[PDB]
């Protein structure tokens, strides 16, 4: 019967969506970290290439 009760019912749905979205990624598997490490490694090679010139 209340404006407030409806409002905080809505917030819970948004929080459930936020939590569900992260969880889907957790179960999907992340391979980003290994890929990122290759970019960081690439940068270290390029430090030497800068240094030589």
């Amino acid at each position: 019967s209340s404006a407030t009760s409806a409002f905080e019912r809505m917030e819970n749905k948004v929080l459930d969506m936020e939590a569900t979205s992260q969880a889907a990624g957790e179960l999907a598997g992340f391979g980003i970290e290994n890929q990122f490490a290759q970019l960081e490694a690439s940068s270290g090679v390029e430090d030497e290439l800068a240094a030589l010139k």
Partner: protein, 53 residues
């Protein structure tokens, strides 16, 4: 004497309501941002994956 005391009671109860309705506007502004983010995240999970036919 009763009126002056009563006005203060009414004024403070209203002030508490005004503050809490203000909390709700603040809630809403940031809460939508999460809904946008969660939805967007879900599309990334789908595009990277997807199985069968």
């Amino acid at each position: 004497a009763q009126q002056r005391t009563m006005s203060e009671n009414l004024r403070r109860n209203l002030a508490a309501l005004e503050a809490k309705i203000s909390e709700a506007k603040t809630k809403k502004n940031m809460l939508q941002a999460r809904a946008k983010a969660a939805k967007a995240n879900a599309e990334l999970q789908q595009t990277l994956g997807g199985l069968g036919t």
